[PDB]
């Protein structure tokens, strides 16, 4: 962890286009739009509402470091993703077919690209059958 705690702060204040210790939530709506997102101001104010645990909106990483210091791979956020398959499960066992996973992948929430969702179920359907099991996916999401 000693080799990443220095150069990350170069990207932390990179959105403000200056040297100030600011996460720049007002300028994040221009930085992400320059990247090609262009969100609304309601979702933009919702970003640092839970990302920045301080509460101001622009920070010298109390929680911008803690956002990096949350690996999202241990057993505290591995069952919450495993519950997201359970909302789609019918008749138990994690039955989810490639057709049903493509049906739910390109339709709801924040949709993926077709070049992403076409190959997303590829490593989770190595047997080629009609059941993309959740345990074969969270094992791929174990390093996420």
């Amino acid at each position: 962890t000693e080799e990443q705690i220095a150069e990350f702060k170069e990207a932390f204040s990179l959105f403000d286009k200056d040297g100030d210790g600011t996460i720049t939530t007002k300028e994040l709506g221009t930085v992400m739009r320059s990247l090609g997102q262009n969100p609304t101001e309601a979702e933009l104010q919702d970003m640092i509402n839970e990302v920045d645990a301080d509460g101001n909106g622009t920070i010298d990483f109390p929680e911008f470091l803690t956002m990096m210091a949350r690996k999202m791979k241990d057993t505290d956020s591995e069952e919450e993703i495993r519950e997201a398959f359970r909302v789609f499960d019918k008749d138990g066992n994690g039955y989810i077919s490639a057709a049903e996973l493509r049906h739910v992948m390109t339709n709801l929430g924040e949709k993926l690209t077709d070049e992403e969702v076409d190959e997303m179920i590829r490593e989770a359907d190595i047997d080629g059958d009609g059941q993309v099991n959740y345990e074969e996916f969270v094992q791929m999401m174990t390093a996420k």
Binding site: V31, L35, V51, E80, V87, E110, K111, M141
Partner: protein, 331 residues
């Protein structure tokens, strides 16, 4: 296409703080009009209903005669019907069959009265209360709660109507020739004794007809208790049935909220793993920030999609059971 669809969403199935105004205000105008119409029969306040009320009715049918055509022209924004031949099945919707009858029949009555005439305006001014409650969201509740409970309703109406047909005949046999305290005979025919049966089986008790002979009072007592119960039954039946259907809509309305927030987590966690491969380098230096940033927003939305349940203390049969399996599962 934008305009037509906007006008559809505005006139039918409407939403937004101004559509409310429009619709409820048209309804309040209908209500003022019907109030003045029913005050035109008091024989002492009849001077208030002058001819300006009639011209306020003809401008009202002028308004509705283009309102129906606006809602007809703005109907082609629907997958169920398109064009002009398809839109006839939009006019099978019985609120529109009611509305067409209202506007054309009130126009026809206003034409012949301008070249018992004013009396027909009262019925076709009462009918305009029904057509501003859109979507039929009230009758769909009742027509399904009655259909779910068809067995008990048919049973108790059959038993109550059998008790009414039977025991309001024995009263007529006990009271066929007996006069009142004022010189008239109450139970003259069977229909008088049956008017009595309906009236006393629903516990009205007007008091025009009371059985005078002491044989008939006993039968009235027996049939009173033993059919007042079976006619007071459907109140409790539909009272359970209405409070059980709205709780069966606040299950699926929460389950319709849970699914896009159980999609926005998995579709974003795959995005957070796809950091290997989506100057082309510093553009990828910024996306690792946003794929970790919005993932936490999706994580908050998913925990706000299941923890607020609705009657929110329904975990009172499975308090320790949701934890007593997981701690066993960790071993």
């Amino acid at each position: 296409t934008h305009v037509q669809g906007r006008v559809y969403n505005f006139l039918e199935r409407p939403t937004g703080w101004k559509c409310f105004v429009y619709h409820f205000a048209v309804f309040l105008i209908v209500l003022v009009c019907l109030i003045f119409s029913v005050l035109s029969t008091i024989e002492q306040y009849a001077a208030l209903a002058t001819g300006t009320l009639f011209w306020m009715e003809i401008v009202l049918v002028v308004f509705f005669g283009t309102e129906y055509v606006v809602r007809l022209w703005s109907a082609g924004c629907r997958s169920k019907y398109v064009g002009l031949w398809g839109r006839l099945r939009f006019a099978r919707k019985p609120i529109s069959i009611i509305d067409l009858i209202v506007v054309v029949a009130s126009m026809v009555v206003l034409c012949v009265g301008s070249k018992s005439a004013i009396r027909g305006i009262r019925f076709l001014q009462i009918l305009r209360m029904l057509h501003v409650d859109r979507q039929g969201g009230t009758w769909r509740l009742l027509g399904s709660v009655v259909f779910i409970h068809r067995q008990e309703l048919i049973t108790t109406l059959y038993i109550g109507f059998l008790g009414l047909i039977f025991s309001s005949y024995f009263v007529y046999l006990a009271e066929k020739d007996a006069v009142n305290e004022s010189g008239r005979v109450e139970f003259g025919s069977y229909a008088d004794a049956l008017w009595w049966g309906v009236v006393t089986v629903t516990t009205i008790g007007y008091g025009d007809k009371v059985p005078q002979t002491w044989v008939g009072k006993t039968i009235a007592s027996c049939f009173s208790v033993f059919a007042i119960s079976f006619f007071a039954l459907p109140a409790g039946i539909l009272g359970s049935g209405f409070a059980l259907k709205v709780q069966q809509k606040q299950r699926q309305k929460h389950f319709n909220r849970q699914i896009p927030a159980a999609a926005s987590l998995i579709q974003t966690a795959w995005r957070c793993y796809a950091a290997e491969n989506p100057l082309r380098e510093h553009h990828r230096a910024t996306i690792k920030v946003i794929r970790r940033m919005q993932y936490f927003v999706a994580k908050k939305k998913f925990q706000q999609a299941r923890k607020p349940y609705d009657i929110e203390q329904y975990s009172q049969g499975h308090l320790n059971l949701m934890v007593r399996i997981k701690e066993l599962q960790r071993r």
